[PDB]
Amino acid sequence: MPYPKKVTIKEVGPRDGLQNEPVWIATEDKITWINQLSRTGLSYIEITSFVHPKWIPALRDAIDVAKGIDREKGVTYAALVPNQRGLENALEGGINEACVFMSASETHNRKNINKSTSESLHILKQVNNDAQKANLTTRAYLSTVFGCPYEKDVPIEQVIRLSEALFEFGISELSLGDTIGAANPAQVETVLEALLARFPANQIALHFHDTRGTALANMVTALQMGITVFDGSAGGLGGCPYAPGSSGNAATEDIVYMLEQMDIKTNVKLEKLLSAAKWIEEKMGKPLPSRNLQVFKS
Amino acid sequence: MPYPKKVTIKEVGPRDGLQNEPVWIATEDKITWINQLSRTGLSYIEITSFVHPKWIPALRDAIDVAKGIDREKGVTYAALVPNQRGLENALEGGINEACVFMSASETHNRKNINKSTSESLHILKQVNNDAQKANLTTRAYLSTVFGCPYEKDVPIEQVIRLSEALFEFGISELSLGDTIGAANPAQVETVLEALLARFPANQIALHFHDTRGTALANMVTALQMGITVFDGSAGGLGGCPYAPGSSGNAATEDIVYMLEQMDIKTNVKLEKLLSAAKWIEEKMGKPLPSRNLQVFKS
């Protein structure tokens, strides 16, 4: 019933945020910004993605940035890993944790990484095995769990099914996401109700997109169900490809702020975060959706 | 426990929204926009404020707009009424409901309408008496209930105290607001817990400001406590004077949307609302904070 005392939030701006922005950030600047983040209080940061540069030109400097960051203690630096070939590069970059990914929706999956849910499942399976065998912590990113942009509705049995497989492989955390951004507190409650009744809440994270501005709202419902892991993007970087001109993931600072007022520890020094958000915003030459960032700019 | 089946949302954009925008909307345009709203599905709209034009130059055309609107059936057209002199003008305008107002915080009250809580209380007391005597429904707007920009913290006993007086006068609904916009789901829960335990939930409305982007979040908590009346502003019109450059009240469409996905009836045809939001946004020449409006603009 009572809200948790501490909740760990994971920053994914330098990755999910930058690869979703139609602007190229100088390879150096990325480092400079990630450095700020490192000494912000956050304990987890997806510095980049090791997907072939052809598909993610905005992050073609993955290997370079992975070796440029300051890398602070107590901080878990992670990177998206598409497959073994990618895990290889990630290993050279020094990434602590590898995050595999796939879609719950067949249509979305096949039309994103071009592979059936089974095929992908098989990939991650071994991609996870080799990762751990290299003394690397793994994390899974199951997308389109709250609805698909193509299939629209997504059955709960699918999520459960996949989720069982993912956990069976040996992953450490399954991050469920709201790709299209059409989840409501009611949906997140029935969904987490069916999931939490089979997997440990400690091993489940949530990645909400407030394309409809319901992220924080969904977060509260989740906080009530027991989830204590939430993904965020500094400044709210990253637009929704399904709906251009609209915000993507929830602004990390907005998440950190509200949690603080609720007397929930995040160990994140908001002040610093806010300063960091403003930085990229300036390098972006475009205003970020973050509400507290605006307040910060007084 | 289970979320309510129906929730009435009140539009206050043409008033709280326009008087908070550093731009003058042609008296006619206001009418044209309020007309759209009237046939949007909303059943309540504060068309304007009858405070002396000297303080609210953006709404100096109150009496003019009050007679220009189309005025649809089943729609409750309300206006802000500062005192008897104002109630007089409102009466000529045809306003169905008068909304008195005051601050819970002494400092805020005295530094806004320049009168102690008692003095104001005394005003509203008789201002309400004359209103009803004229066959007019009354509503009270208690502000700074979740914190003051000056006194910062605000004791719950104060709200209760005033709230008891307000209800004792004969008002029909007490709308509690988050002026500074620094309320969290935890605060709205303890607050509504202490209030709902003395006054009927049906006679209590909430006016949240997502200056910190926590509006909808706070709304969920409220929806869980029993409140079924929420104030909103089409497009998110109206900035926060305490923090310029940041959004004010929650975007009506965002509120209507989330509620719909949760299977809660608002009888508001979102599509129409969204269209209306875009309209003023264009007349504003500035983008509105509304998330769904952005999605609408595809």
From Swiss-Prot, chains A, B:
Ranges of residues in domain Pyruvate carboxyltransferase: 7-274
Keywords: Lyase, Metal-binding
Binding site for a divalent metal cation: D16, H207, H209, N249
Single GO term (MF): metal ion binding
Oligomeric form and interacting partners: Homodimer and homotetramer.
Stored PANTHER family: HYDROXYMETHYLGLUTARYL-COA LYASE
Functional note: Involved in the catabolism of branched amino acids such as leucine.
UniProt protein name: Hydroxymethylglutaryl-CoA lyase YngG
